[PDB]
C-alpha cells in the first residue's frame, strides 16, 4: 500500500532550476510533497525576481500548485524558470 | 583555448556538456549536438533568454567556461 513511500519519509531530491534570464543553474533541495510554490518561495529567498516567471519541465509550462511528485521530478532533474513580458 | 559549456536541451530536460573554442560558431555547436543524436531541426539557441544567430561565435555570444546555453524547439 503505502509501505514503500512510508519508509521514505526523509527522501530529498537535489534538483536544478535553470534561470533562463540569468543563464544560471540554481540547485534546490526539495521534497516530493513540495509544491512549485514552495520552490518559488525558496528562489525568492535567494533574491530571484519571481514576478511573472513560470516553471517549465520538458518544455511544458507547470502550474504553481503541482507538486514535485506530480511534476515527476527526481534527483538531478533540471527545471526551467521563464520570464513572461 | 577551450571552454566547457553546457547545453540545456529543453525538450529532453538534459544538460549536455560540450567543449568548444571561442571561434566556434553556434553552427559548429549544432553539428556537435547532431553528432550526439540531438534532433536539432528547427531548434534554436538562447542565452540570457535572447535567441541567438547560428553565425555568432562562442566569443561574440560572450560565452565562457561553464556557460549554460538553452536549446528550444521552434513554433
Ligand atoms: Cl576551428
Amino acid at each position: 500500500e503505502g509501505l514503500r513511500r512510508g519508509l521514505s519519509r526523509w527522501k530529498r531530491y537535489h534538483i536544478k532550476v535553470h534561470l533562463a534570464d540569468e543563464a544560471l543553474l540554481l540547485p534546490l533541495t526539495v521534497r516530493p510533497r513540495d509544491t512549485l510554490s514552495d520552490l518559488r518561495a525558496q528562489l525568492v529567498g535567494q533574491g530571484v525576481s519571481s514576478w511573472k516567471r513560470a516553471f517549465y519541465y520538458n518544455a511544458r509550462r507547470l502550474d504553481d500548485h503541482q507538486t514535485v511528485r506530480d511534476a515527476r521530478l527526481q534527483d538531478g532533474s533540471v527545471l526551467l524558470l521563464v520570464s513572461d513580458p
Side-chain angles (χ1 to χ4, degrees), chain A:
Chain A
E1 199 282 324
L3 214 221
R4 177 240 189 171
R5 327 102 248 265
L7 296 148
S8 58
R9 95 115 281 163
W10 286 107
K11 193 195 287 290
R12 297 293 182 274
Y13 296 152
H14 291 74
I15 71 171
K16 301 178 180 174
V17 182
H18 181 190
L19 320 181
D21 309 280
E22 294 79 359
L24 251 26
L25 290 177
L26 274 58
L28 290 180
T29 305
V30 302
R31 279 171 288 196
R33 269 134 198 90
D34 286 356
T35 68
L36 294 199
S37 284
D38 298 330
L39 273 62
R40 181 176 307 271
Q42 284 200 67
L43 291 174
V44 172
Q46 305 190 9
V48 175
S49 309
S50 301
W51 184 33
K52 290 206 300 165
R53 300 205 191 187
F55 295 100
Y56 289 72
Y57 194 58
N58 289 116
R60 290 109 33 168
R61 183 185 223 261
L62 293 169
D63 185 88
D64 250 35
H65 292 81
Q66 308 189 211
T67 76
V68 170
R69 193 191 301 286
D70 287 310
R72 303 207 72 176
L73 304 175
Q74 61 184 258
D75 221 56
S77 296
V78 182
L79 241 19
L80 183 61
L81 182 72
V82 181
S83 296
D84 190 14

